[PDB]
């Protein structure tokens, strides 16, 4: 069942990549 | 700000974000279905469809795939025991994959609908505010529900374009997916008739199409519009929660009692089959038929299939589990390996004796052996100071016919008492306990776990109906009563309760 | 916001309408089964489980 | 056609005729007689 | 298409008394159910 | 004692996840 | 590959096959069935090394990665026993101009034991055959 | 409110918010259909309960 | 080692009692 | 596989505790 933990940490990393790209803090010139 | 229990209320007047959260919920349900199927496939043992079927292994979503036509893996094996079968894409793995892809697509569509919340579709062109014509929405959704219901009945279940559904013999020995013709008579309301399920879906789909048309075309009466608050989406939430718990109570009942849609090869036997000796009576009928043809006892008992004897075992009854006895039934008694055969217990005077079987109610049960006319001839005594019918005292021997112990006779009271305790549980089986480290207490099947979940959710969803129905009907006083309310509530002032125009002035 | 923020700790005024409550409960059963006196009602609330637990003790 | 089917149909008829219909008739009657003056 | 700001947003609050009540509820539910989880 | 092998992780997560939810919501209050 | 994902390697062979017919043959024709036995050597030779470098005439005789538990594994002792198989060659086509013969075969033989780690499975192989008989 | 092609196709299907038939409308026919539905649910419940036995089948796994 | 989990949940409850008393939201008349 | 019996709880807590710390600090930002 160690495969479940490996899939979970890899999925967490990929989901963080998705949210960090698609919902980044947008760069703004002020 | 909002309390924690009211956070989701931000979508209440936001139809775009309401769609988004609906999409997200659906994405999560589809992703659960895919991931649960993948986990089950990662741990499913397909080597023995007789003594280790899916309901001994804790398989929850695999029987629901099996029910509607998906019976086979990519990796060779079918749940029907067949091998060498080509499912195409629609194996268990393909279905799980499709649900995972669907879940990803619905997640992406949720994201779009969250960001792009402010679509003009969602605004009344008369006013500027957001508005949903809920009766027209109902007509559209009911029409489509009727179309999908009719199509699932007429094409999928009939096999016209589709696989059909799981059907079986009454004793769960020959279960397979086949096309089913509808049954248009009163036997279509027999719950064990699959043709009744096909007829339902054709007729209710047709009625749903017709009712969709009415609801697409005819506006509600003003009395019903104001009475049921049809401009409030919470009224739809209340009535939908009500229909949903009705349906949940129904599926819990048809899981627990048995149905054409809950076959015993997929979910395990019912508790009522053990209660009435359903399988015992059939095995005995079959042996008696073979004895009437002229066979010996060993010959007659050897023709009983191991699957049929496996159904006649109390550890396969779903009313023997525990709330915190978790997992597969294989984690309980073990993985079943072989039927040991049928015991016949005889006393020293050659009276055949049957061990009284353990009922579903009893965690423990005394070992009692009665003769043909219901007289207790043997038992295992608790106190052996004044025992009169101990196995040792009555000279009880046991001979096995069929199975692993065929032709053997046991006379040691240790073995005879052990086989008596085995006969208490029904047909005796040899179990492998070291594979799953089985602890020796019975688990319930997927049938019992489904019934529990759905009975409990249905009961909790009654509260949700009453809550949301109340919040619909009492929305004007949700933050509190009017600051007056003194003369309206007093006794005898008005002829009608709360009606201001019916004042007596007396 | 939560309805509990309609009460201020130490406020002099009553936070609910006892007459509405009485007018509800005296129509739920009948009029004289309902307390119109808050002191009488609170006494009954105190007295009933205290007497019951005294008896079972 | 069975005795239990006949008893069910008679149950429908007598549930209407004993409970539902005279309650409906008496309620309509006493409402139209004992009206409220506004 | 424009990404317009949503006006239906509301802040969420959980006061300190509600936090203490919730933490106590969570702790006693753990106390109650841990023996059954261990079995 | 021969306890459930998932009992420890179930107990810790069953406590920890709502504890985390309450702490998150409390600390952000006043924003 | 079997249904269930079990991969069965086996040493398909006709090594030292001796096969007799029924007596009373004056020719080779469509009724000639050579039924007999052949040797099946072990799938892995005695020079094969397992993934922990254990073998028969080479490699360790113990589990060196577990120094306090090195000799508690029965897989440390490798063996390559000689198995036996049955082969039936049924001739169905005889070209007497060139002495060519063709037909079918059914064969039964054990599978790979992986140096005696596991019990061998029974493998049945059916196929076709050709030969040239030198008159 | 942002316009979209699909929104323009779907717009007349969300344009009659609040539109009612005055008075009681079709409520009597609706009540008739609810009464027939209640009778249907009673029939299938009593069949499943074995309080209503019909010829041609038996409520059992064999049928 | 189940005793560790029991001690932890009981300790968490008692610590919540301490913090809920000694560091309560103070009642104020306004 | 005969893995460490504490490996799952160690991995989940080793991920979850700093994840919770970061989520707590992010959600309260702007107070
Ligand atoms: C293309 C669409 C599609 C298809 C073909 C499937 C197909 C399948 N799904 Mg999947 N599913 C889908 C979309 C789809 N799903 C979506 C969008 C979700 C997210 C909600 C899911 C979530 C999901 C779960 C959670 C599960 C499945 C499961 C399954 C399998 C069993 C289905 C079953 O028993 O249905 C049962 C469906 C019903 C009994 C429908 C009841 C509807 C009620 C009776 C009607 C309600 C009243 C009605 C509206 C009013 C009357 C109308 C009338 C008058 C006409 C099957 C392989 C199961 C499985 O085996 O998983 C691997 C399972 O557990 N699915
Ligand atoms: C030829 C036409 C035809 C045929 C053959 C069928 C055949 C069937 N219908 Mg369908 N039906 C049809 C047309 C048809 N229908 C049409 C046109 C409609 C109108 C759209 C319906 C609407 C309909 C509904 C709404 C239901 C059926 C059901 C059924 C099944 C009944 C057997 C069963 O399992 O009952 C079992 C179910 C019941 C006996 C109903 C239970 C009612 C409960 C007791 C009331 C609930 C009270 C409360 C909420 C519960 C609390 C209990 C407490 C202890 C907690 C069967 C497959 C039922 C079904 O699908 O069951 C799986 C069902 O519920 N039918
Ligand atoms: C209706 C839902 C449903 C049903 C019937 C089942 C049924 C089943 N699943 Mg599946 N499962 C589901 C949902 C469901 N599952 C979901 C959503 C997930 C994802 C988390 C899983 C994940 C899953 C896994 C990973 C496994 C199963 C397994 C199983 C089997 C064993 C069940 C078991 O041991 O439960 C035990 C249930 C309990 C001990 C009850 C716990 C309920 C808690 C204690 C209630 C908490 C009360 C609450 C805190 C009080 C509120 C407080 C108050 C203030 C309000 C069984 C066939 C197992 C199996 O055999 O697989 C083949 C298995 O390994 N399932
Ligand atoms: C389709 C079903 C459905 C839907 C759409 C809603 C929707 C809603 N409900 Mg209702 N409700 C339902 C069923 C439903 N409820 C049922 C079944 C019950 C009885 C248990 C209730 C009891 C109820 C109450 C008492 C209240 C609501 C409230 C609300 C509103 C805000 C809820 C919120 O912010 O939660 C936010 C919730 C959390 C942040 C934490 C919830 C943690 C739960 C306890 C466990 C998590 C569950 C798990 C993740 C998912 C499994 C559930 C699934 C198996 C069904 C929202 C309109 C509230 C309201 O009216 O506000 C005005 C309110 O006070 N509901
Ligand atoms: C304690 C039970 C209870 C209570 C207090 C309520 C209360 C409410 N319901 Mg719900 N409802 C219930 C059960 C309940 N309901 C059940 C079991 C269902 C079926 C699943 C529904 C379905 C439902 C819908 C669909 C709607 C409501 C609505 C409402 C609200 C308006 C009043 C109304 O329509 O009542 C409903 C009236 C009753 C429940 C009484 C009916 C009396 C029955 C018909 C007698 C029949 C006797 C029968 C022949 C006995 C034979 C059975 C035997 C053979 C087994 C209110 C909040 C409406 C709402 O939410 O508005 C915002 C709404 O749209 N209810
Ligand atoms: C549904 C069925 C039912 C119900 C409702 C009750 C109800 C009751 N039973 Mg009965 N009982 C039942 C079935 C039932 N029983 C059955 C089936 C049996 C047979 C198996 C019994 C056998 C039985 C016995 C033998 C006794 C009861 C008693 C009681 C009472 C217990 C409450 C009590 O004494 O509070 C009173 C309050 C207390 C005891 C609490 C004192 C608290 C102290 C003062 C402070 C403690 C502080 C604590 C340590 C720390 C606080 C936390 C924090 C501050 C640190 C109550 C009236 C008991 C009784 O009558 O008591 C006299 C009793 O002794 N019952
Ligand atoms: C046509 C057809 C078929 C329809 C039928 C209808 C019809 C037309 C018929 C007419 C005839 C008719 C109506 C009757 C005949 C039918 C019949 C015989 C009915 C049976 C009646 C029956 C089964 C009754 C038993 C159920 C019942 C309600 C029991 C009594 C309950 C009761 C006395 C409880 C109160 C006890 C009590 C101490 C009250 C205080 C409780 C309490 C502490 C509350 C707290 C509280 C109270 C307050 O006070 C306020 C303020 C506040 C703050 C507050 O906290
Ligand atoms: C993010 C958050 C998600 C994480 C949350 C953390 C949760 C922690 C506690 C979870 C509670 C479940 C613990 C059970 C103990 C356990 O270890 O089970 C362990 C079991 C698995 O059980 C294992 O199964 C194996 C076979 O795969 C073997 O047989 C093992 O021997 C067996 O232990 O896990 C589950 O079964 C989870 C499925 C739960 C389905 C329950 C359906 C019934 C629904 C009831 C609804 C009740 C509602 C009450 C409402 C009020
Ligand atoms: C155990 C206790 C039993 C309790 C029973 C007591 C009575 C229950 C009340 C029933 C209420 C039902 C809906 C409300 C009435 C209504 O629609 O408006 C009243 C309407 C229109 O009012 C008329 O309407 C006219 C115009 S319009 O239609 O309103 O626009 C208007 O001009 C006129 O003034 C007005 O009167 O009057 C009628 O036409 C009455 C029709 C009958 C009512 C339909 C109920 C359906 C149930 C059928 C059951 C049997 C079926 C058999 C199945 C096997
Ligand atoms: C993004 C994307 C994608 C992906 C997707 C994926 C990968 C997914 C998934 C998903 C998943 C994989 C999911 C899931 C889920 C789960 C769930 C949703 C669950 C749950 C839970 C619950 C709810 C439970 C609860 C409970 C408990 C905990 C215990 C007991 C009690 C109960 C049962 C209640 C793709 C590429 C395709 C496409 C593109 C996009
Ligand atoms: C969207 C796709 C992304 C990747 C997700 C897919 C993986 C998720 C888990 C589901 C896998 C289930 O698929 C199934 O897994 C088991 C476990 O390895 C495989 O089983 C394989 O290994 C086991 C033991 O290691 C052997 O006993 C078995 O004979 C062998 O075939 C099955 O051959 C495969 O069909
Ligand atoms: Ca004596």
CSV table of C-alpha atoms in Angstrom, one decimal, chain G residues 42-91:
chain,number,residue,atom,x,y,z
G,42,UNK,CA,16.3,-26.6,-16.9
G,43,UNK,CA,15.3,-23.2,-18.3
G,44,UNK,CA,18.2,-21.4,-16.4
G,45,UNK,CA,21.6,-23.0,-16.7
G,46,UNK,CA,23.8,-23.7,-13.7
G,47,UNK,CA,25.8,-20.5,-14.6
G,48,UNK,CA,22.8,-18.3,-14.2
G,49,UNK,CA,23.0,-15.7,-11.5
G,50,UNK,CA,19.8,-14.6,-9.7
G,51,UNK,CA,19.3,-10.8,-8.8
G,52,UNK,CA,21.1,-11.4,-5.6
G,53,UNK,CA,24.0,-13.1,-7.4
G,54,UNK,CA,23.2,-16.7,-6.3
G,55,UNK,CA,23.5,-19.6,-8.7
G,56,UNK,CA,24.6,-23.2,-8.9
G,57,UNK,CA,28.3,-23.4,-9.9
G,58,UNK,CA,28.8,-19.7,-9.5
G,59,UNK,CA,27.5,-17.1,-7.1
G,60,UNK,CA,26.8,-16.9,-3.4
G,61,UNK,CA,25.2,-19.7,-1.5
G,62,UNK,CA,23.5,-17.3,1.0
G,63,UNK,CA,21.6,-14.0,1.1
G,64,UNK,CA,24.6,-11.6,1.6
G,65,UNK,CA,22.5,-8.5,1.9
G,66,UNK,CA,21.1,-9.8,5.2
G,67,UNK,CA,24.2,-10.9,7.1
G,68,UNK,CA,22.4,-12.1,10.3
G,69,UNK,CA,19.7,-13.8,8.2
G,70,UNK,CA,21.8,-15.0,5.3
G,71,UNK,CA,21.2,-18.8,5.5
G,72,UNK,CA,17.5,-18.8,6.3
G,73,UNK,CA,16.3,-18.8,2.7
G,74,UNK,CA,15.6,-22.0,0.7
G,75,UNK,CA,16.2,-20.0,-2.5
G,76,UNK,CA,20.0,-20.0,-1.6
G,77,UNK,CA,20.1,-23.6,-2.8
G,78,UNK,CA,19.7,-23.7,-6.6
G,79,UNK,CA,19.1,-26.9,-8.6
G,80,UNK,CA,18.6,-27.7,-12.2
G,81,UNK,CA,16.8,-31.1,-12.5
G,82,UNK,CA,16.3,-32.8,-15.9
G,83,UNK,CA,12.6,-32.9,-16.8
G,84,UNK,CA,10.8,-35.0,-19.3
G,85,UNK,CA,8.3,-34.2,-22.0
G,86,UNK,CA,6.0,-36.1,-24.3
G,87,UNK,CA,5.7,-35.4,-28.0
G,88,UNK,CA,3.4,-36.8,-30.6
G,89,UNK,CA,4.3,-36.1,-34.2
G,90,UNK,CA,1.4,-37.1,-36.5
G,91,UNK,CA,2.3,-37.1,-40.2
